[PDB]
Amino acid sequence: MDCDHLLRLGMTAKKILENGKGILAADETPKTLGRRFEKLGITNTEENRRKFREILFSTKGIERYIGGVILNQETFEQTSGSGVPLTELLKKKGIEIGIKLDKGLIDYKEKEKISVGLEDLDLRCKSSAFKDATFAKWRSLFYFYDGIPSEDCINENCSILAKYAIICQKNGLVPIVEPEVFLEGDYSMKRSYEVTRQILSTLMKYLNYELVYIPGVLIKASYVTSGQLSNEKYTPKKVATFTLRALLSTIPCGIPGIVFLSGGHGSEDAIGFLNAINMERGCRTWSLSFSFARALTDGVLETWRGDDSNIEEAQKILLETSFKACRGAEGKLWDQE
Amino acid sequence: MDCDHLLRLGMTAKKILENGKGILAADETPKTLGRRFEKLGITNTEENRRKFREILFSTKGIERYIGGVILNQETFEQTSGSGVPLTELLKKKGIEIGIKLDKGLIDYKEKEKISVGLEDLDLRCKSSAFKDATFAKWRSLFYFYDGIPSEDCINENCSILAKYAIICQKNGLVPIVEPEVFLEGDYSMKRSYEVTRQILSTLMKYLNYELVYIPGVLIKASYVTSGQLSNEKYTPKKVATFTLRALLSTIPCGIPGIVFLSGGHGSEDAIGFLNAINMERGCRTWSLSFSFARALTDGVLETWRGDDSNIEEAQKILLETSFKACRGAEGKLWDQE
Numbered sequence: 001m002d003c004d005h006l007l008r009l010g011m012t013a014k015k016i017l018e019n020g021k022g023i024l025a026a027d028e029t030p031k032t033l034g035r036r037f038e039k040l041g042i043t044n045t046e047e048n049r050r051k052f053r054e055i056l057f058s059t060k061g062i063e064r065y066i067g068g069v070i071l072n073q074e075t076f077e078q079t080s081g082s083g084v085p086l087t088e089l090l091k092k093k094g095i096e097i098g099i100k101l102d103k104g105l106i107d108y109k110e111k112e113k114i115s116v117g118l119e120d121l122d123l124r125c126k127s128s129a130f131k132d133a134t135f136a137k138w139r140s141l142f143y144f145y146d147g148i149p150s151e152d153c154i155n156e157n158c159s160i161l162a163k164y165a166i167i168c169q170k171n172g173l174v175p176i177v178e179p180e181v182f183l184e185g186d187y188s189m190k191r192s193y194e195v196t197r198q199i200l201s202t203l204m205k206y207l208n209y210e211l212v213y214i215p216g217v218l219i220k221a222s223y224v225t226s227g228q229l230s231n232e233k234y235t236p237k238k239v240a241t242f243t244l245r246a247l248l249s250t251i252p253c254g255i256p257g258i259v260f261l262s263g264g265h266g267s268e269d270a271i272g273f274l275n276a277i278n279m280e281r282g283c284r285t286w287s288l289s290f291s292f293a294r295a296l297t298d299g300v301l302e303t304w305r306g307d308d309s310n311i312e313e314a315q316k317i318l319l320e321t322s323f324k325a326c327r328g329a330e331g332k333l334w335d336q337e
Numbered sequence: 338m339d340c341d342h343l344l345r346l347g348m349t350a351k352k353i354l355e356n357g358k359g360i361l362a363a364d365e366t367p368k369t370l371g372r373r374f375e376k377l378g379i380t381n382t383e384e385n386r387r388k389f390r391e392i393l394f395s396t397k398g399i400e401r402y403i404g405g406v407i408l409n410q411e412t413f414e415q416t417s418g419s420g421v422p423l424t425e426l427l428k429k430k431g432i433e434i435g436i437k438l439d440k441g442l443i444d445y446k447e448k449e450k451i452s453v454g455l456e457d458l459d460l461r462c463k464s465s466a467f468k469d470a471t472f473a474k475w476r477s478l479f480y481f482y483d484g485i486p487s488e489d490c491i492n493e494n495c496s497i498l499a500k501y502a503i504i505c506q507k508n509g510l511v512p513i514v515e516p517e518v519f520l521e522g523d524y525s526m527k528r529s530y531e532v533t534r535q536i537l538s539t540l541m542k543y544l545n546y547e548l549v550y551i552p553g554v555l556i557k558a559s560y561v562t563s564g565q566l567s568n569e570k571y572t573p574k575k576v577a578t579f580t581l582r583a584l585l586s587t588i589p590c591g592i593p594g595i596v597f598l599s600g601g602h603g604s605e606d607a608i609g610f611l612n613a614i615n616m617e618r619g620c621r622t623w624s625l626s627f628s629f630a631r632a633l634t635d636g637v638l639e640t641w642r643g644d645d646s647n648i649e650e651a652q653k654i655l656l657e658t659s660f661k662a663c664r665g666a667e668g669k670l671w672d673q674e
């Protein structure tokens with residue numbers, strides 16, 4: 001944790017987001033990907049999970065738009081149909097390799113969650129399995145109900161995120177901290193805005209109390225919207241205004257980038273919100289980019305459907321959707337390249 | 338607290354610091370100024386306090402360097418020798434008028450302090466006395482000993498600052514929040530650095546929990562150094578490095594400016610640290626300027642000495658010291674204008 005060591009972390013964080021690039025999140029656990037597969041009639045075999053990731057990672061030209069990919073631990077042990085380790089597909093493309101390091105969530109208080117896995121995190125970061133990884137991801141999730149998120153749950157999750165971040169950095173990995181505001185709930189956009197300001201300001205408190213190197217941390221955040229069960233409407237401009245206000249109010253100049261999660265919003269909406277936030281005026285130092293799983297890969301799944309004959313078209317949709325995300329990351333989606 | 342109302346606050350915060358300008362703090366209570374007077378053989382009469390402020394405010398050309406002045410409540414009731422209200426001296430110069438609104442400090446826990454006066458703050462902000470004021474100041478003070486500042490004292494002071502800030506803004510005043518790290522103590526520069534990161538990150542938490550308009554808040558901060566009782570040395574470059582790192586780690590892009598307090602450091606050291614921080618590289622949105630009482634007015638006091646014959650020379654020293662501070666505010670002190 002010397003000066004050159006700290007500069008390498010900042011260089012990695014910037015490389016992931018250079019030139020309007022963003023992150024393809026491919027880190028779904030077998031259970032989470034399985035559910036997605038089963039809706040579309042695809043069998044949850046290890047082989048189909050391996051093939052799905054091969055389809056994503058082998059897409060030609062994807063590195064123009066994708067600066068990093070977040071892998072699931074299992075995918076590090078996997079090869080392509082042709083024999084090449086899946087990580088080698090990304091390395092050869094110059095794409096940064098990430099590892100999701102949380103062990104999921106457990107119950108906290110009444111109706112809330114904390115994320116787990118810190119006890120062996122340092123040991124796991126040193127696994128030879130992840131030797132090629134240069135960044136990591138850890139997700140917490142904030143449920144919304146009456147009087148919730150509670151302050152205890154904000155503090156505990158921010159504490160856990162910050163502890164994970166410092167361990168990552170000590171092992172030479174850039175941490176993505178993901179304080180996700182869960183979309184499935186009944187809350188107004190005002191309430192999301194206000195609580196996002198609490199969560200993000202508290203996260204910055206704990207990162208600072210843990211003396212995390214702030215230029216080597218990426219924040220993966222939810223857009224500010226009302227909850228899916230609210231009857232409240234919003235437009236991309238309003239999402240952009242509220243989200244950017246919350247970020248300008250909470251995120252220090254030293255943070256290199258914010259990457260938005262799609263969170264259950266549509267692919268089109270998530271990309272449209274990104275474009276709108278990048279068209280907003282308001283001085284800032286950090287990039288506003290993407291870390292999408294669903295918004296980038298739902299179309300791939302829906303086109304592929306487990307049939308090899310559909311793969312070329314599935315890869316085409318990945319590339320085209322990645323292009324749009326990247327254009328959104330620079331506020332240029334309305335403009336012809 | 339409508340949109341135009343919020344834009345006026347941001348415009349005021351920017352006007353105070355435009356063009357490398359800074360703040361002349363002249364807000365010493367009769368007791369605090371009195372002690373300064375008595376060291377230099379000057380009688381603590383109301384007349385000498387009035388005359389001292391007249392000497393400061395009537396200095397020709399001071400508005401090139403000073404964007405705002407922080408007044409003591411008593412000075413709003415005062416006139417020049419020639420009959421002109423002292424506030425009119427500043428208004429005519431286009432200098433923003435501020436009011437210090439705290440009622441000082443009281444004991445908290447063991448050996449710590451909190452600042453007081455929130456109970457009638459809203460009423461006081463509406464006083465016709467302060468009709469010409471456009472900004473305010475409120476000071477908390479953090480003592481350092483073993484295990485101190487305590488977390489309770491950080492939280493309580495940040496809470497008080499944030500409550501004051503929101504009341505100010507609701508009354509159309511830009512709040513300066515002053516979480517001063519007291520120089521008189523025995524602590525290392527590492528410890529100051531780490532605790533400054535705790536204090537400033539926690540302050541940003543409470544400002545966010547109070548839903549303060551972040552573009553309409555100014556932060557008056559201590560430089561990061563070791564304590565006066567420490568035998569540890571430092572240079573301007575090291576102060577600059579540590580202070581800017583702490584600020585980049587904690588202060589959101591939305592804050593318009595940080596103004597350093599001189600804090601018991603020499604006039605020359607305080608101006609030299611300002612120059613050094615403004616020569617540092619590292620992207621940021623906020624101005625780095627000054628809010629000095631001692632660093633700007635100790636020389637004036639020492640030249641004047643209560644003798645009218647010395648006033649012209651005293652004003653010359655104010656103007657020359659203000660020039661240097663302003664050059665420091667743009668990192669140009671080594672360079673000839």
Ligand SMILES: *[C@@H](C=O)COP(=O)(O)O
Nearest residue numbers: 025261262263292293294
């Ligand atoms: C990133 C997960 O690692 C965000 O995924 P989403 O875009 O919400 O499916």
Ligand SMILES: *[C@@H](C=O)COP(=O)(O)O
Nearest residue numbers: 362598599600629630631
């Ligand atoms: C500002 C007081 O209002 C700072 O005063 P100092 O420069 O520390 O004497």
